[PDB]
């Protein structure tokens, strides 16, 4: 039976940030674990926030708040910048 993964997407990213570089299967599994872990953290924080303000809908604002709360230092700044850029381009 078929199962979901992130391997191809990670490989596409890697081929963008290192045109000539291979990645082992163990590394791919670790990366899948990391992606899943971060996704869970952000989603749960967003739900907790959405519950605090009695909102039925989780919107980009809650996600941004969650990310800001969760990532330390300039990394949060860059993350917010990237997300905002992506959303802005998405609307147009």
């Amino acid at each position: 039976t078929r199962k979901e993964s992130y391997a191809i997407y990670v490989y596409k990213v890697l081929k963008q940030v290192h045109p000539d570089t291979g990645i082992s299967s163990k590394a791919m599994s670790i990366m899948n674990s990391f992606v899943n872990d971060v996704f869970e953290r952000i989603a749960g924080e967003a739900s907790r926030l959405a519950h605090y303000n009695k909102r039925s809908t989780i919107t980009s604002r809650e996600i941004q708040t969650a990310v800001r709360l969760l990532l330390p230092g300039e990394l949060a700044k860059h993350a917010v910048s990237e997300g905002t850029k992506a959303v802005t381009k998405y609307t147009s």
């Binding site: 605090y52 303000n53 708040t65 800001r68 709360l69």
Partner: protein, 78 residues
Amino acid sequence: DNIQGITKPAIRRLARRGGVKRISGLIYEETRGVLKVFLENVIRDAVTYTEHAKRKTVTAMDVVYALKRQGRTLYGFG
């Protein structure tokens, strides 16, 4: 400089409550720095919660949520 408001005898009092018999002369500044860092983190989180809530006043529940986020649950201010 309001950090100096945390008086030397006040730090001695906290230590006495902790069970310290003799205090060195540099403990006070180190404690000042530590407390500053801790308060900075907690306040940053609390103001983040407030600004997300669109409030201008900082509620106590925000302090509670921040302390929970740090991992120090507080009973009483619920």
